[PDB]
Amino acid sequence: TTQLIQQVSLTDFFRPDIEHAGSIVLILRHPSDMIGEANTLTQAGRDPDVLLEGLRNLFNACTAPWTVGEGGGLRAYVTSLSFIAACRAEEYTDKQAADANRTAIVSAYGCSRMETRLIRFSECLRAMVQCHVFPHRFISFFGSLLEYTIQDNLCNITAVAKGPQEAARTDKTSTRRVTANIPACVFWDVDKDLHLSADGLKHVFLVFVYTQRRQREGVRLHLALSQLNEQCFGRGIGFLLGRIRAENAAWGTEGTRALPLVQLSNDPTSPRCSIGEITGVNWNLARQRLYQWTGDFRGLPTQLSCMYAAYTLIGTIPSESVRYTRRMERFGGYNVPTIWLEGVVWGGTNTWNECYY
Amino acid sequence: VAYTDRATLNPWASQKHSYGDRLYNGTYNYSPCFKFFTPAEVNTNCNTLDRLLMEAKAVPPGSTEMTQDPCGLFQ
Amino acid sequence: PFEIEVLLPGELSPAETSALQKCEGKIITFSTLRHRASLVDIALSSYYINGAPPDTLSLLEAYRMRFAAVITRVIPGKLLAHAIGVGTPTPGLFIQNTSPVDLCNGDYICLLPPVFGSADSIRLDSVGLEIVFPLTIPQTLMREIIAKVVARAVERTDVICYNGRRYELETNLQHRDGSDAAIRTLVLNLMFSINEGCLLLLALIPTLLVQGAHDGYVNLLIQTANCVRETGQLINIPPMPRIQDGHRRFPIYETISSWISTSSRLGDTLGTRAILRVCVFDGPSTVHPGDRTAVIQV
Amino acid sequence: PFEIEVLLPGELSPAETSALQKCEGKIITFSTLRHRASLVDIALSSYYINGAPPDTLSLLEAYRMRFAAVITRVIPGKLLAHAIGVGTPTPGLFIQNTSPVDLCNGDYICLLPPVFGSADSIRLDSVGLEIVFPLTIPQTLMREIIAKVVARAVERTAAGAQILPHEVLRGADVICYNGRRYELETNLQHRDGSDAAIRTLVLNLMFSINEGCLLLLALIPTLLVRFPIYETISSWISTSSRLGDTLGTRAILRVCVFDGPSTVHPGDRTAVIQV
Amino acid sequence: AIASEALSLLSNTYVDGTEIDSSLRIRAIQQMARNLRTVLDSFERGTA
């Protein structure tokens, strides 16, 4: 009834040893595509190679740094949700839960070359949202972790693709069943902000809030759980994010007379330009003036410079009146508040809807 | 081919770019006369006609273009 | 296979029960999905926005917000129905054609309120409510209708030919709290389709109509359009500026790329999205009004 | 499970029936679904419209209205296939890569007509028909492909329309994926498909955008510091909605690889899951 | 309701025979009986 996906990768961003069974795991595209997209989509005036500076130092502080460029299949493919949650923990509203998860992921990992890795990833995302290379097209989604095998610094993991959560058999734990586990920092249900009844079926989304200013950019990651419709979620999110939308509309771009067309077309006795001269023999004295309009529009907010969020459907919960449970348990050698979701069917294609308003 | 005494019957609808071919050719972008002035289809029509002829000589094939389509392979 | 149950009120008249049994493959809607439900949500009374029967444009928004379901076999006591929106496996799904227009194989189905003559619907006097069933047309019919109602909307603040037959639309627009929202979402898309790149495409109008002549394709396209065929002989369009960073940037890329996302979004936000695909096995190519066709979940 | 059989023709020459076996994990498309079918529906002959060969618009449109199916195996006198339609639980579904760009795990599959280069396909001269296979790439690349090829075509008309070309540029357009540069269309000459199939494509796309950011400039004159005026609005909305519906993005499959190599190169086959 | 692990323990069809399951199956069927004995009486109680 369910399907599985296997993949081997480097363990510098993901550790299937400490991560609990049932957590979310994401994958990354090849970093070589970032520069090919940045040098062509960077806003006019901005420096396009600050991303390259921010990116090179990331792998300089990562094992096997001489293995970038060929993509033979031995790169850091997958990553964990808690990793990004800890990298951007200074931006979530739940101060204590954020910093607790941060120190926990620092201690449980190598804890020697981990803090440097985190700050490199932090400004890496900061430079990612500096040239309109938004990190919602480079971060895909995998199902919850089910089984793993590791020998040293290289792991083979398998996760569910789509279907019921407790329809698999992990077959090495105490029980043969697992449930979805998430850090309490990313969880954010919108219906209890929008003040509507929470009964019935609810969808799951991931959002990527963007802040665009001068030398100050921010990117969070929220796992929203709402009963709102497939497309109506966009109109719902704008009501809560109305501030950042207006901030971006004014601080997004930092790098002329009208014409009365309908007026002079409603009235006659205007200079006409019949097709007889556009045939193409002397098409300069025919169009000598005909108007001037002195018109040009270069610097204006595009629909891409005012974007502030991008969501995507992941799964639903058919059981009405969900009863998600939040509690603190040990994660390595530290306790972190995790929320436990039961009976969630994965599915849905990876299509991102961008909320630019 | 049939009348070995003249090329065509009207020089306005049989040339490479005659008036009729320019009006309708199917290759220049319902009409019943489309199945005549269109090389892309008359080629395969006459080709399957030839295949029928060769099968008749060797004496299916197709069992069609005789029924449901007379004068289709005959032009 | 997820099915929802619809509670039939007791003491129902046999005439109403017979009329209800005739509604076998019609589409209904739900505000909140659940296994057990009542009949007050299917009634038109649940559509009320402020205190009254809803408007058309209000129904356009109620169709997006609410979940959808399809009716299946009805027993004298219960009314079973299956859901379509959420991802669920459902074998052998047939729907009943409710529009006056014919459908054929390979047609996407949309959802819109009845804009033709007074919609037929089951009436329940003893219960005191009246349920109305939505109308289903193909996609192309949906876009042409939507464009006309909004055009009439901005006019306040209609014939349609198809298969050689003309139809008249009666647009109900007595409300106002919904008509202004359609104008807001319309200009918002027009405003975001303006980049630094228009000036290039705007500077091609002279050569455009030259290609309109002596080529034989752009003629009616110039005819059906009005703004471009009037601007081409009335404005000068100052020649050209330069690019800020032109050594590594391509400026006509964003305007041709960003526009794609708007056009795809425009057809959905203005009205309803595609919900189903009709594909019948061992059946006729074209279905007539009142008949049932086996359809696929989109 | 539903499966379609494509009746192989008789008297097939050995070189022709052999090359049909070379394309095993290739997808075909069926107008109507049936257990038995001929070959004309698979050939391009059934695909052209108004007599003339189909264009990209007709290609993109027909890909939506027409249904898809995948070939599984070939028999010297029999050819079967499996459908991606209603609910068929096709087991062990594998497909072959027809695009020059590699694929990886967790990538979604969507279809496109061949735009980059000449369409490689089988041609049966003995019977007189040929079978063209659609190109498949991930979703995250599709929107960028269409935007670039139209931008390449409009920049060509601009150079030809303008008395003086504005040649000064950045070099050559290159798409990158998995650290591999494709580098499409080196030369300026060899206008193979410049205006051959995408001719009418750039026409509809440039006019809607022209009508788009002109209608706003002609309705509110305050943005920058006899006449219907409504029929133009209804026409623009109807067109922009239809054009957006045609140029849509809908995933059809998902590459799910188990105990196999993650990255696949053009020509390799891989197992996929029905989305 | 029935637990998925119990369903998997019951649908084995004699592919076992160790000692860490002779008690698991017994407790599963005991839970089954204890649940059914109340689901049955639910109707007798709901009549009134």
Tab-separated table of N, CA and C in Angstrom, chain A residues 108-182:
chain	number	residue	atom	x	y	z
A	108	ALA	N	24.827	16.894	19.829
A	108	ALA	CA	24.668	15.520	19.369
A	108	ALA	C	25.542	15.224	18.160
A	109	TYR	N	25.836	16.233	17.350
A	109	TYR	CA	26.703	16.057	16.194
A	109	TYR	C	28.159	16.151	16.646
A	110	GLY	N	29.078	16.288	15.688
A	110	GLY	CA	30.495	16.326	16.020
A	110	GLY	C	30.861	17.393	17.034
A	111	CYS	N	30.165	18.531	17.005
A	111	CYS	CA	30.307	19.605	17.983
A	111	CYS	C	31.676	20.275	17.891
A	112	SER	N	32.525	19.794	16.985
A	112	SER	CA	33.830	20.390	16.735
A	112	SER	C	33.821	21.305	15.517
A	113	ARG	N	33.404	20.790	14.369
A	113	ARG	CA	33.268	21.579	13.151
A	113	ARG	C	31.798	21.738	12.794
A	114	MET	N	30.949	21.887	13.812
A	114	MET	CA	29.518	22.031	13.607
A	114	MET	C	29.040	23.473	13.651
A	115	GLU	N	29.561	24.282	14.576
A	115	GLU	CA	29.136	25.676	14.664
A	115	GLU	C	29.536	26.448	13.416
A	116	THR	N	30.763	26.237	12.934
A	116	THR	CA	31.208	26.876	11.704
A	116	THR	C	30.339	26.478	10.525
A	117	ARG	N	30.025	25.187	10.415
A	117	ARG	CA	29.143	24.717	9.356
A	117	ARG	C	27.806	25.443	9.393
A	118	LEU	N	27.263	25.645	10.593
A	118	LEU	CA	25.953	26.275	10.716
A	118	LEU	C	25.991	27.726	10.256
A	119	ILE	N	27.029	28.472	10.643
A	119	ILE	CA	27.039	29.873	10.230
A	119	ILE	C	27.273	29.974	8.728
A	120	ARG	N	28.059	29.064	8.152
A	120	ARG	CA	28.235	29.096	6.706
A	120	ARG	C	26.905	28.876	6.003
A	121	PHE	N	26.144	27.873	6.446
A	121	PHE	CA	24.818	27.634	5.886
A	121	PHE	C	23.900	28.833	6.096
A	122	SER	N	24.065	29.547	7.211
A	122	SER	CA	23.178	30.670	7.494
A	122	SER	C	23.339	31.777	6.461
A	123	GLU	N	24.538	32.354	6.353
A	123	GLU	CA	24.767	33.328	5.283
A	123	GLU	C	24.665	32.701	3.897
A	124	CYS	N	24.785	31.378	3.780
A	124	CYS	CA	24.546	30.781	2.470
A	124	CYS	C	23.116	31.039	2.016
A	125	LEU	N	22.148	30.775	2.894
A	125	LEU	CA	20.757	31.106	2.607
A	125	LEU	C	20.556	32.614	2.480
A	126	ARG	N	21.269	33.392	3.297
A	126	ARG	CA	21.164	34.846	3.215
A	126	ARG	C	21.592	35.362	1.848
A	127	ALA	N	22.670	34.812	1.291
A	127	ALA	CA	23.096	35.182	-0.053
A	127	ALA	C	22.229	34.529	-1.116
A	128	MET	N	21.617	33.389	-0.798
A	128	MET	CA	20.654	32.786	-1.709
A	128	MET	C	19.520	33.756	-2.000
A	129	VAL	N	18.902	34.294	-0.953
A	129	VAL	CA	17.956	35.407	-1.130
A	129	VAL	C	18.803	36.671	-1.027
A	130	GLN	N	19.558	36.921	-2.090
A	130	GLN	CA	20.154	38.219	-2.376
A	130	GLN	C	20.111	38.564	-3.849
A	131	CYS	N	20.008	37.567	-4.729
A	131	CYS	CA	19.990	37.755	-6.173
A	131	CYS	C	18.782	37.072	-6.798
A	132	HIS	N	17.719	36.872	-6.018
A	132	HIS	CA	16.496	36.224	-6.485
A	132	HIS	C	16.780	34.801	-6.968
A	133	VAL	N	17.354	34.002	-6.072
A	133	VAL	CA	17.650	32.598	-6.328
A	133	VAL	C	16.914	31.789	-5.266
A	134	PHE	N	15.725	32.265	-4.888
A	134	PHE	CA	14.930	31.827	-3.741
A	134	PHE	C	15.009	30.324	-3.510
A	135	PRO	N	15.276	29.895	-2.279
A	135	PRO	CA	15.505	28.479	-1.980
A	135	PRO	C	14.224	27.676	-1.775
A	136	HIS	N	13.254	27.883	-2.662
A	136	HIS	CA	12.083	27.026	-2.714
A	136	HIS	C	12.043	26.170	-3.965
A	137	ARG	N	12.989	26.360	-4.881
A	137	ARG	CA	13.137	25.492	-6.038
A	137	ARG	C	14.309	24.536	-5.905
A	138	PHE	N	15.114	24.668	-4.852
A	138	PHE	CA	16.262	23.795	-4.660
A	138	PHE	C	16.098	22.845	-3.487
A	139	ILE	N	15.008	22.961	-2.738
A	139	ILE	CA	14.751	22.095	-1.597
A	139	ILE	C	13.503	21.278	-1.889
A	140	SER	N	13.690	19.997	-2.153
A	140	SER	CA	12.592	19.093	-2.418
A	140	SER	C	12.126	18.486	-1.092
A	141	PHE	N	11.325	17.425	-1.170
A	141	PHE	CA	10.760	16.772	0.004
A	141	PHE	C	10.867	15.260	-0.137
A	142	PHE	N	11.311	14.596	0.927
A	142	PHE	CA	11.197	13.148	1.040
A	142	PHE	C	10.248	12.812	2.177
A	143	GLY	N	9.801	11.563	2.207
A	143	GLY	CA	8.933	11.108	3.269
A	143	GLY	C	9.685	10.944	4.575
A	144	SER	N	8.953	10.480	5.585
A	144	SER	CA	9.546	10.269	6.898
A	144	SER	C	10.521	9.102	6.845
A	145	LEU	N	11.621	9.235	7.583
A	145	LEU	CA	12.639	8.197	7.612
A	145	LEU	C	12.068	6.898	8.161
A	146	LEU	N	12.424	5.783	7.527
A	146	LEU	CA	11.940	4.473	7.946
A	146	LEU	C	13.057	3.535	8.374
A	147	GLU	N	14.115	3.415	7.580
A	147	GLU	CA	15.228	2.537	7.901
A	147	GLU	C	16.519	3.205	7.444
A	148	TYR	N	17.635	2.822	8.065
A	148	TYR	CA	18.931	3.400	7.737
A	148	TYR	C	20.026	2.402	8.055
A	149	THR	N	21.152	2.543	7.362
A	149	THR	CA	22.337	1.737	7.648
A	149	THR	C	23.559	2.581	7.329
A	150	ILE	N	24.486	2.687	8.276
A	150	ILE	CA	25.659	3.537	8.137
A	150	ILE	C	26.873	2.786	8.664
A	151	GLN	N	28.028	3.012	8.037
A	151	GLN	CA	29.279	2.417	8.489
A	151	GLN	C	30.293	3.477	8.907
A	152	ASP	N	30.538	4.493	8.082
A	152	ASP	CA	31.262	5.684	8.533
A	152	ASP	C	31.033	6.780	7.503
A	153	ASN	N	30.544	7.934	7.964
A	153	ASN	CA	30.425	9.176	7.188
A	153	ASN	C	29.685	8.987	5.860
A	154	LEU	N	28.980	7.870	5.709
A	154	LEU	CA	28.227	7.563	4.505
A	154	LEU	C	27.104	6.613	4.882
A	155	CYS	N	25.876	6.986	4.535
A	155	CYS	CA	24.708	6.269	5.019
A	155	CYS	C	23.773	5.941	3.869
A	156	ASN	N	23.069	4.822	4.002
A	156	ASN	CA	22.023	4.411	3.076
A	156	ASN	C	20.707	4.423	3.839
A	157	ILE	N	19.808	5.325	3.458
A	157	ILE	CA	18.541	5.494	4.152
A	157	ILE	C	17.405	5.199	3.186
A	158	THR	N	16.292	4.739	3.747
A	158	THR	CA	15.078	4.528	2.978
A	158	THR	C	13.903	5.134	3.726
A	159	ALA	N	13.049	5.826	2.979
A	159	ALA	CA	11.915	6.544	3.531
A	159	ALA	C	10.673	6.255	2.702
A	160	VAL	N	9.515	6.547	3.280
A	160	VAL	CA	8.234	6.344	2.616
A	160	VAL	C	8.060	7.416	1.555
A	161	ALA	N	7.306	7.094	0.507
A	161	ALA	CA	7.061	8.049	-0.567
A	161	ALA	C	5.689	8.700	-0.425
A	162	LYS	N	4.638	7.887	-0.359
A	162	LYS	CA	3.286	8.389	-0.173
A	162	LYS	C	2.395	7.270	0.343
A	163	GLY	N	1.423	7.644	1.169
A	163	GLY	CA	0.505	6.692	1.744
A	163	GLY	C	0.412	6.814	3.251
A	164	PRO	N	-0.270	5.865	3.884
A	164	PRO	CA	-0.413	5.895	5.341
A	164	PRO	C	0.928	5.811	6.049
A	165	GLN	N	0.976	6.464	7.207
A	165	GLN	CA	2.224	6.547	7.949
A	165	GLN	C	2.524	5.239	8.670
A	166	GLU	N	1.529	4.677	9.361
A	166	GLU	CA	1.679	3.435	10.111
A	166	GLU	C	1.287	2.214	9.296
A	167	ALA	N	1.556	2.221	7.999
A	167	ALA	CA	1.386	1.040	7.165
A	167	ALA	C	2.704	0.342	6.847
A	168	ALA	N	3.812	0.786	7.434
A	168	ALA	CA	5.113	0.184	7.199
A	168	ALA	C	5.571	-0.578	8.441
A	169	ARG	N	6.697	-1.278	8.314
A	169	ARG	CA	7.254	-2.062	9.414
A	169	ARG	C	8.731	-1.728	9.546
A	170	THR	N	9.069	-0.862	10.498
A	170	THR	CA	10.473	-0.532	10.707
A	170	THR	C	11.287	-1.736	11.165
A	171	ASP	N	10.642	-2.709	11.814
A	171	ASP	CA	11.135	-4.068	12.043
A	171	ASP	C	12.465	-4.132	12.779
A	172	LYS	N	12.934	-3.047	13.381
A	172	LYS	CA	14.104	-3.211	14.232
A	172	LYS	C	13.910	-2.478	15.551
A	173	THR	N	12.941	-1.569	15.609
A	173	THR	CA	12.646	-0.861	16.847
A	173	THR	C	11.850	-1.777	17.772
A	174	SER	N	11.389	-1.214	18.887
A	174	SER	CA	10.530	-1.964	19.790
A	174	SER	C	9.239	-2.364	19.093
A	175	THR	N	8.477	-1.378	18.630
A	175	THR	CA	7.302	-1.617	17.812
A	175	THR	C	7.696	-1.530	16.346
A	176	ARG	N	6.798	-1.977	15.481
A	176	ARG	CA	7.014	-1.904	14.046
A	176	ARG	C	6.341	-0.699	13.409
A	177	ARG	N	5.935	0.287	14.204
A	177	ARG	CA	5.211	1.444	13.701
A	177	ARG	C	5.883	2.729	14.163
A	178	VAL	N	5.758	3.768	13.342
A	178	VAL	CA	6.333	5.076	13.629
A	178	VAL	C	5.307	6.147	13.291
A	179	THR	N	5.485	7.326	13.883
A	179	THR	CA	4.626	8.473	13.634
A	179	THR	C	5.489	9.689	13.334
A	180	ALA	N	4.883	10.690	12.702
A	180	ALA	CA	5.624	11.874	12.289
A	180	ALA	C	6.017	12.697	13.508
A	181	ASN	N	7.279	13.114	13.555
A	181	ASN	CA	7.807	13.915	14.650
A	181	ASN	C	8.409	15.190	14.084
A	182	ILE	N	8.078	16.324	14.694
A	182	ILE	CA	8.607	17.611	14.235
A	182	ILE	C	9.032	18.433	15.431
